[PDB]
Amino acid sequence: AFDWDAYLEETGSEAAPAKCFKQAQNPPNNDFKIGMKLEALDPRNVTSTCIATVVGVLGSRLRLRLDGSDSQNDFWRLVDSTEIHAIGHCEKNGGMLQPPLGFCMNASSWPGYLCKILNNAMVAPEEIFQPEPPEPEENLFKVGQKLEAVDKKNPQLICCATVDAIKDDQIHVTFDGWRGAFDYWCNYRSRDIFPAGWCARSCHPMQPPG
Numbered sequence: 001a002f003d004w005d006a007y008l009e010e011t012g013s014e015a016a017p018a019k020c021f022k023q024a025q026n027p028p029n030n031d032f033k034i035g036m037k038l039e040a041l042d043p044r045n046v047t048s049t050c051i052a053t054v055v056g057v058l059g060s061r062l063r064l065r066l067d068g069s070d071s072q073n074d075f076w077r078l079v080d081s082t083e084i085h086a087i088g089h090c091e092k093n094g095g096m097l098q099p100p101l102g103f104c105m106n107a108s109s110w111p112g113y114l115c116k117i118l119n120n121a122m123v124a125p126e127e128i129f130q131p132e133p134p135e136p137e138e139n140l141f142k143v144g145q146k147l148e149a150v151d152k153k154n155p156q157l158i159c160c161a162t163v164d165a166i167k168d169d170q171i172h173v174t175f176d177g178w179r180g181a182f183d184y185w186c187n188y189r190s191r192d193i194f195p196a197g198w199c200a201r202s203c204h205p206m207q208p209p210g
Contacts, residue, residue, distance in 0.1 A: 001200045001206075002160065002199075002200065002206045002207075002208055004146075004196045004197055007146075007160070008146060008196070011146075013144060013145070013146050013162070014144070014145055014146070015145065015146050015147065015195060015196035015197075016140075016141050016142070016145035016146065016147045016163065016195060016196075017140070017195070018195045019136060019140055020136060020140040020141045020145075020147075020188065020195070021136070021147075021193060021194060021195055022133055022134075022135040022136065022188075022189045022190070022191060023133050023191075023193075023194055023195065023198065024080060024130075024133040026201070027059065027060045027198060027201050027202030028060050028078070028079050028080045028130035029060075029079075029130070030057055030059065030060050030061070030062075030079050031079075031128040032054050032057055032062055032079060032124055032128060033054065033057075033122070034054050034055060034056065034057065035053060035054060035122045036053070036054045036122050036123060036124040037051055037052070037053050037054075037067070037087060037117075037118070037121045037122060037123050037124065038051075038052055038053075038054070038064075038084055038085065038086060038087060038123070038124045039051065039052070039084065039085045039086065039087055039089050039090050039097070040052035040064055040066070040075075040077065040083060040084045040085075041083045042066060042098070042100050042101055043073070043075050044073065044100070044101035044102065045098075045101045048098035048099075048100070048101070049085075049089075049090045049095060049097055049098060050066045050067070050097065050098055050099070050100045051066065051067045051068075051087070051097060051114070051117060051118070052064040052065065052066050052067065052084070053065055053066075053067055054124070055074060056074075058076075058156070058204055058205075059199065059202035059203050059204025060078050060079055060080070060202045060204070061076050061077065061078055061079070061204065062076065062077050062078075062079065062084070063075075063076055063156070064076070064077060064084075066100035066102070067100070067117045068099065068100060068103050068104055068105065068113055068117065069100040069101075069102035069103060069104065070102050070104065073102060075155065076150070076155045076156065077191075078130075078191055079128070079129065079130045080129075080130035080131060080132055080133060081132075081191060082132050084129065085126075085129065086123070086124060086125065086126035086129060087118070087121075087123050087124075089126075097114060099113070135189050136188060136189070139166065139168065139169050139170075139171070139188040140188070141163050141166060141171045141188055142163070142166070143163055143164070143165060143166055144162065144163065145162070145163045146160070146161065146162050146163075146176075146196055147161055147162075147163065147173075147193055147194060147195060147196060148160065148161065148193070148194040148195070148196060148198055148199050148206060149161035149173045149175070149192060149193050149194070150192040150193070151175065151182055151207075152182070152184055152192065153182045154182075155192075157205075157207050158194065158199055158204060158205070158206055158207065159175050159176075159206070159207040160175070160176045160177075160206070160207060160208055160209050161173050161174060161175050161176060161193075162174050162176055164183065167185075169187055169188055169189075170185045170186065170187060170188070171185070171186060171187075171188055171193075172184075172185050173185070173186060173193065175209075175210065176209035176210065177208075177209030177210025178209075178210040
């Protein structure tokens with residue numbers, strides 16, 4: 001557990017208040033189990049809803065892999081992400097499930113594939129999907145404020161970071177102790193940013209400065 005209070009004191013810094021973040025006040029409970037299947041937007045084509053399997057769990061997050069793709073493009077979503085849903089959600093809403101971009105077979109072999117993978121599948125029930133947190137009405141972040149941020153190049157990691165700059169709805173996230181190597185701009189509504197102390201509260205590891 002990272003001593004944020006000691007760190008903010010020695011850097012003469014403030015943590016961005018919880019109200020800046022599109023995150024729940026308390027980290028949402030994670031009742032997902034490894035092997036559970038669900039529907040997720042394909043990160044390599046966000047127009048597509050695909051079958052994903054929980055291949056890992058960490059704090060309030062899921063490590064997801066798209067069925068019939070590869071093991072090199074896993075992605076992490078919170079249990080209260082709006083990009084994941086129970087199986088049947090897509091169809092209920094007028095849509096069709098799609099093959100993943102990295103599908104390992106040919107596209108005509110898709111309809112049969114879906115039947116095979118969904119057959120007697122472990123499915124995440126709709127009740128363990130958590131409600132989407134309320135979002136801030138404006139960008140409340142201020143330059144100099146510290147927070148916890150996902151390293152988008154190594155998304156298993158959530159790290160000590162600082163808001164470097166602000167342009168309207170975008171904040172510039174810099175990772176303390178890492179000389180701008182994996183900084184990024186993101187919307188203030190990002191699900192990849194958390195208030196200081198959130199990881200400890202959710203039983204997710206939190207990386208100290210580089």
